[PDB]
Design a protein around this motif. Sequence first.
Motif, PDB file in Angstrom:
ATOM      1  N   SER B  23       0.823  -1.198   0.000  1.00 56.47           N
ATOM      2  CA  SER B  23       0.000   0.000   0.000  1.00 56.47           C
ATOM      3  C   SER B  23       0.864   1.257   0.000  1.00 56.47           C
ATOM      4  N   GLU B  24       0.257   2.367  -0.424  1.00 56.12           N
ATOM      5  CA  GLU B  24       0.965   3.644  -0.437  1.00 56.12           C
ATOM      6  C   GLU B  24       1.118   4.218   0.966  1.00 56.12           C
ATOM      7  N   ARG B  25       0.211   3.865   1.880  1.00 57.41           N
ATOM      8  CA  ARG B  25       0.297   4.359   3.251  1.00 57.41           C
ATOM      9  C   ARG B  25       1.532   3.829   3.966  1.00 57.41           C
ATOM     10  N   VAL B  26       1.975   2.619   3.622  1.00 56.35           N
ATOM     11  CA  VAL B  26       3.200   2.078   4.203  1.00 56.35           C
ATOM     12  C   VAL B  26       4.390   2.960   3.847  1.00 56.35           C
ATOM     13  N   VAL B  27       4.450   3.424   2.598  1.00 56.76           N
ATOM     14  CA  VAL B  27       5.520   4.325   2.186  1.00 56.76           C
ATOM     15  C   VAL B  27       5.348   5.694   2.831  1.00 56.76           C
ATOM     16  N   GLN B  28       4.104   6.169   2.937  1.00 55.24           N
ATOM     17  CA  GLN B  28       3.858   7.479   3.535  1.00 55.24           C
ATOM     18  C   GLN B  28       4.264   7.524   5.002  1.00 55.24           C
ATOM     19  N   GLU B  29       4.121   6.415   5.723  1.00 49.34           N
ATOM     20  CA  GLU B  29       4.416   6.376   7.148  1.00 49.34           C
ATOM     21  C   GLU B  29       5.863   6.010   7.457  1.00 49.34           C
ATOM     22  N   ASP B  30       6.706   5.836   6.437  1.00 45.50           N
ATOM     23  CA  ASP B  30       8.142   5.598   6.619  1.00 45.50           C
ATOM     24  C   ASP B  30       8.409   4.368   7.482  1.00 45.50           C
ATOM     25  N   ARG B  31       7.626   3.310   7.274  1.00 48.51           N
ATOM     26  CA  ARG B  31       7.754   2.129   8.118  1.00 48.51           C
ATOM     27  C   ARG B  31       8.968   1.281   7.758  1.00 48.51           C
ATOM     28  N   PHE B  32       9.413   1.316   6.506  1.00 40.05           N
ATOM     29  CA  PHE B  32      10.573   0.552   6.062  1.00 40.05           C
ATOM     30  C   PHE B  32      11.647   1.464   5.479  1.00 40.05           C
ATOM     31  N   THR B  33      11.804   2.649   6.061  1.00 41.99           N
ATOM     32  CA  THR B  33      12.847   3.584   5.662  1.00 41.99           C
ATOM     33  C   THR B  33      14.086   3.339   6.513  1.00 41.99           C
ATOM     34  N   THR B  34      15.248   3.270   5.866  1.00 41.43           N
ATOM     35  CA  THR B  34      16.491   2.940   6.549  1.00 41.43           C
ATOM     36  C   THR B  34      17.528   4.028   6.305  1.00 41.43           C
ATOM     37  N   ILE B  35      18.490   4.122   7.218  1.00 45.23           N
ATOM     38  CA  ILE B  35      19.584   5.084   7.127  1.00 45.23           C
ATOM     39  C   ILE B  35      20.860   4.329   6.783  1.00 45.23           C
ATOM     40  N   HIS B  36      21.589   4.827   5.789  1.00 46.97           N
ATOM     41  CA  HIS B  36      22.842   4.233   5.351  1.00 46.97           C
ATOM     42  C   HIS B  36      23.936   5.290   5.395  1.00 46.97           C
ATOM     43  N   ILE B  37      25.089   4.920   5.945  1.00 48.85           N
ATOM     44  CA  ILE B  37      26.195   5.840   6.179  1.00 48.85           C
ATOM     45  C   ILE B  37      27.416   5.338   5.424  1.00 48.85           C
ATOM     46  N   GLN B  38      28.075   6.244   4.708  1.00 53.69           N
ATOM     47  CA  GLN B  38      29.234   5.932   3.885  1.00 53.69           C
ATOM     48  C   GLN B  38      30.405   6.812   4.299  1.00 53.69           C
ATOM     49  N   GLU B  39      31.616   6.274   4.184  1.00 56.34           N
ATOM     50  CA  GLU B  39      32.834   6.971   4.578  1.00 56.34           C
ATOM     51  C   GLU B  39      33.732   7.191   3.367  1.00 56.34           C
ATOM     52  N   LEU B  40      34.252   8.409   3.234  1.00 57.87           N
ATOM     53  CA  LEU B  40      35.202   8.769   2.192  1.00 57.87           C
ATOM     54  C   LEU B  40      36.461   9.340   2.832  1.00 57.87           C
ATOM     55  N   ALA B  41      37.613   9.059   2.225  1.00 61.66           N
ATOM     56  CA  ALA B  41      38.895   9.438   2.805  1.00 61.66           C
ATOM     57  C   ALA B  41      39.735  10.223   1.807  1.00 61.66           C
ATOM     58  N   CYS B  42      40.418  11.248   2.313  1.00 60.50           N
ATOM     59  CA  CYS B  42      41.381  12.035   1.552  1.00 60.50           C
ATOM     60  C   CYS B  42      42.702  12.017   2.303  1.00 60.50           C
ATOM     61  N   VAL B  43      43.766  11.589   1.629  1.00 57.23           N
ATOM     62  CA  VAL B  43      45.079  11.426   2.245  1.00 57.23           C
ATOM     63  C   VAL B  43      46.032  12.438   1.627  1.00 57.23           C
ATOM     64  N   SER B  44      46.648  13.258   2.474  1.00 57.74           N
ATOM     65  CA  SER B  44      47.659  14.220   2.063  1.00 57.74           C
ATOM     66  C   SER B  44      49.031  13.668   2.424  1.00 57.74           C
ATOM     67  N   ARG B  45      49.870  13.470   1.407  1.00 56.42           N
ATOM     68  CA  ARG B  45      51.191  12.869   1.520  1.00 56.42           C
ATOM     69  C   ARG B  45      52.273  13.903   1.224  1.00 56.42           C
ATOM     70  N   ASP B  46      53.523  13.474   1.373  1.00 59.30           N
ATOM     71  CA  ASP B  46      54.693  14.312   1.153  1.00 59.30           C
ATOM     72  C   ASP B  46      55.409  13.858  -0.111  1.00 59.30           C
ATOM     73  N   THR B  47      55.696  14.803  -1.000  1.00 57.74           N
ATOM     74  CA  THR B  47      56.353  14.535  -2.270  1.00 57.74           C
ATOM     75  C   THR B  47      57.752  15.146  -2.276  1.00 57.74           C
ATOM     76  N   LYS B  48      58.440  15.004  -3.412  1.00 57.98           N
ATOM     77  CA  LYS B  48      59.782  15.568  -3.528  1.00 57.98           C
ATOM     78  C   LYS B  48      59.734  17.084  -3.682  1.00 57.98           C
ATOM     79  N   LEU B  49      58.748  17.597  -4.413  1.00 61.25           N
ATOM     80  CA  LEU B  49      58.599  19.038  -4.613  1.00 61.25           C
ATOM     81  C   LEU B  49      57.686  19.652  -3.559  1.00 61.25           C
TER      82      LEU B  49
END
Lengths: 96, 49, 96
Positions: B23-49
């Motif tokens: 039913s549409e009411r199930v979607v309207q009431e957020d009964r099967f809504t889930t939260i998903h969390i993702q991680e992103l990484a940025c690495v700063s390194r040392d070069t010759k210049l």
Amino acid sequence: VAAKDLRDCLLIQLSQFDKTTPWLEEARLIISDHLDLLANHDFRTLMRVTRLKEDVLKEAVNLIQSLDPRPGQSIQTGEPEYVIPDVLVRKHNGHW
Amino acid sequence: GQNMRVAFMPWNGYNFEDSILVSERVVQEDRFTTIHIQELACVSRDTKL
Amino acid sequence: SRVTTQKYLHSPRGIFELKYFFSSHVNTEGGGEASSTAIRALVKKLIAAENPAKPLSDSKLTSLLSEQGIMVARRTVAKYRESLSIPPSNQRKQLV
DNA sequence: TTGTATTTATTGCAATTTTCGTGCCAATTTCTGG
DNA sequence: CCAGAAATTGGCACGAAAATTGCAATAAATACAA
């Protein structure tokens, strides 16, 4: 891209702007005719030759500086190059 | 999970071969809504210049 | 001289060449010596914190340095600025 | 016990060349006062 | 507004000082045979 020099690249980029831009003509004139003394940072002989004012010349200069100097750097390809150190110096328990 | 009011009957072929009609009411009431969390990484390194 | 050739040292600050630590010097006030690397860093810091309307010339930079004790000549300051790849005073001013 | 052959230990001098800071000065850049 | 000056900049030079580079076959400690 594939421009002969900086003046050609700037003119190519400026020819894609619509005529409705407030300061298009002044920037085009400066780029086409007087760019060497703009690089020399004269800002005074430029006023004399172009016959403009400080509040207009500044806007033209800002419009020019808003352009992209290196079109081909949008696609960056490569990798930084590192070295392997021969000796390591660190800080242990309050000394080197 | 969640407690759902359910009826066992065929409905116009929309529950054919293990299909589920919701039913549409199930979607309207957020009964099967889930939260998903993702991680992103940025690495700063040392070069010759 | 032979050992320190093309050998790199890794420190929390970065990677150096183990010959980066050998430098010339100028006389300071009262007594002592000041390294050219320290003077280059000071010149870069002072130039990076100037008024854009009127950039610091070499005489003004020499006068500013000769308050902390350093005794560096105008020509030496010009040489350091050229080594840092920094344009002269008249080419660092801006219309703002 | 002693002269002799083997295996270590040697990593510095002395030229020659490069770089240093700073002065002299001609050629540009800005400032000023009449 | 225009000269004229005052200021700025960088090439060349100088003597000291620093850095680089070419040397080519030795001296003592040690195990060992007479």
